[PDB]
Amino acid sequence: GYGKGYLAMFKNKKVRFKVVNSFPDLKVQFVTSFPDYKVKISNSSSFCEETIKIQVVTSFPDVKLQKVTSFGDFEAYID
């Protein structure tokens, strides 16, 4: 579906990550180093620009994301 550069649209924005097991928009692997993007996980569902379905994987993701508590590329509320 989406590519590695899709999330770049949401720089300093907030999206909603919908966890799925089949037909995701993005296969996502969570890392602690060398990500494609740094993401700040939100506790609020407010002000989400868009719903993106993500499947958590351990190999061959579409994007690698690093959870951070500050200075993220974008925000995400996990559903």
In this structure, the chain runs to a length of 79
Question: CA-to-CA distance for 66 and 40, rounded, in angstroms?
Answer: 8
Whether 31 maps to a domain, the answer reads yes
Please give the residue range of the domain that contains residue 42: 7-78
Which method was used? Answer: X-ray
Q: Is 69 helix (H, G, I), strand (E, B) or coil?
A: coil
Whether 2 maps to a domain, the answer reads no
Whether 1 maps to a domain, the answer reads no
Q: How many domains does the chain have?
A: 1
Whether 64 maps to a domain, the answer reads yes
The full DSSP string for the chain is ---TTSGGGGTT-EEEEEE-SSS-SEEEEEESSS-SEEEEEES--TT---EEEEEE-SSS-SEEEEEESSS-SEEEEE-
Tell me which residue of 77, 69, 74 sits closest to 37, measured CA to CA: 74
Whether 71 maps to a domain, the answer reads yes
